[PDB]
Swiss-Prot record, chain A:
There is a cross-link at K6, K11, K27, K29, K33, K48, K63 (Glycyl lysine isopeptide (Lys-Gly) (interchain with G-Cter in ubiquitin)). There is a cross-link at G76 (Glycyl lysine isopeptide (Gly-Lys) (interchain with K-? in acceptor proteins)). Changing S65A: Prevents phosphorylation in case of mitophagy. Decreased localization of PRKN to mitochondria. Changing R54D: Decreases affinity for UBE2R2 in CRL2(FEM1C)-UBE2R2 complex. Changing R74K: No effect on ADP-ribosylation. The record marks H68 as: Essential for function. Belongs to the ubiquitin family. Transmembrane segments: none annotated. Residues 1-76, 77-152, 153-228, 229-299 form the Ubiquitin-like domain. This is Polyubiquitin-C. Changing T66A: Abolishes CteC-catalyzed ADP-ribosylation. It comes from Homo sapiens. The chain holds residues 1 to 299 of 685 of the full protein.
UniProtKB/Swiss-Prot annotation, chain B:
It comes from the Eukaryota. It comes from Homo sapiens. It is found in: Cytoplasm; Nucleus. Interacts with TNFAIP3 and IKBKG (polyubiquitinated); facilitates TNFAIP3-mediated de-ubiquitination of NEMO/IKBKG. Interacts with polyubiquitin. Interacts with MAPK1, SELPLG and PIK3CD. Interacts with IRAK1 (polyubiquitinated). Interacts with MYD88; the interaction is indicative for participation in an activated TLR-signaling complex. Interacts with HIV-1 matrix protein. Interacts with TAX1BP1. Residues 7-60 are annotated as: Ubiquitin-binding domain (UBD). Changing D27N: Abolishes binding to polyubiquitin ('K-63'-linked and linear). Ubiquitous. Strongly expressed in peripheral blood lymphocytes, spleen and skeletal muscle, and is weakly expressed in the brain. In peripheral blood mononucleocytes, isoform 4 is mainly expressed and isoform 1 and isoform 7 are almost not expressed. Expression of isoform 1 and isoform 7 increases in leukemic cells. The chain holds residues 446 to 505 of 636 of the full protein. The lineage of its organism: Eukaryota, Metazoa, Chordata, Craniata, Vertebrata. The gene is TNIP1. This is TNFAIP3-interacting protein 1.
Amino acid sequence: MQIFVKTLTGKTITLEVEPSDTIENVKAKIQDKEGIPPDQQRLIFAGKQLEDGRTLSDYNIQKESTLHLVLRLRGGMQIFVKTLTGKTITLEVEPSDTIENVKAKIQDKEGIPPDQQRLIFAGKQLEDGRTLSDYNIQKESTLHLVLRLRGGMQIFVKTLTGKTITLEVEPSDTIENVKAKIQDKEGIPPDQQRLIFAGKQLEDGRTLSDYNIQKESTLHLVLRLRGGMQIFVKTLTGKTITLEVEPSDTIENVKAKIQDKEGIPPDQQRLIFAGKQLEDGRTLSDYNIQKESTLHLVL
Amino acid sequence: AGALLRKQELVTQNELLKQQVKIFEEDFQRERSDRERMNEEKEELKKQVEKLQAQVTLSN
Amino acid sequence: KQELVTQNELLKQQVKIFEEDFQRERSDRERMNEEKEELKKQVEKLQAQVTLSN
């Protein structure tokens, strides 16, 4: 059947519903159509409230009925959002509300467009697509809002599998800056990255705006099989392995790489080069370790 | 029947209740502002606790 | 006529709902004051710990 719902401001709305439907589902339908979450609604029939665990048939609600909707001033959960200016705003949010929703609500309450917003919670940056439940944002939590001026852009970088990451970049950021950001957010050395957009590889010397890359653009990432610098390692059994390294790598890094190659834990790794020990602290540059120089391990 | 008297009573109740709704909304807005300011204070105290904890942690 | 009585019942319900929301906001403020006092006590405890350095 079809029923009508009227507000104190004569906004009549039509709802296609069945008499065997609960009232929380009628509230969910009102949320689908008007965007009013069910916790901020109050439905009244003939002067009586409508309880969520009750059906329309129980209230003798026939066809062409007219319910009355009163909207509340608050919901069950609120968050605080503090600008860099120091102004605190309250938001009526929900555990299912995604970051897109809270950015839209900040726009509603402050006019700040969502493309210029980035939200920080407990040292982490919130990304569009995930909900407050994912980021474990409880009631009365405080999000720090910051603005990406000077051409702030969210770009996505997707590998041949599906592992998509999000990067904050400017049009003037060069492809080398982007590979550096990928190195900082995923660990991939830039000498192993190849970035592609619209089908062509991106040269290290051009900017993002040179390739007409705009907001929400998806760059494809391809991992080389090789880097620029490789070193050889000989196991206690005598097998040789090759590690893709950089001169700025620390002995902890090369020990993690050894753990990836041969599964040996780093505490049982003692590296030797030219009759010397390799302190965990110093880097490969501090040991003059050149490309293709071999190292020996043994405890 | 004296419908004018009941009509005027209903209109007076109508305007009074509208004013009451307006007043209660203003009161809720004031309470919300005070709650926001209290959250500002609470965040300042959280920052102070974080600083003191960082000072204590420096003790080895 | 009858529309007046309808809107008056609606307004009474709305007054009730708004008073409920105000009371909820005030309860939230009371609890936040409790948390603020707990944070003050924690500041005092950490200051007493800091004093125990030198």
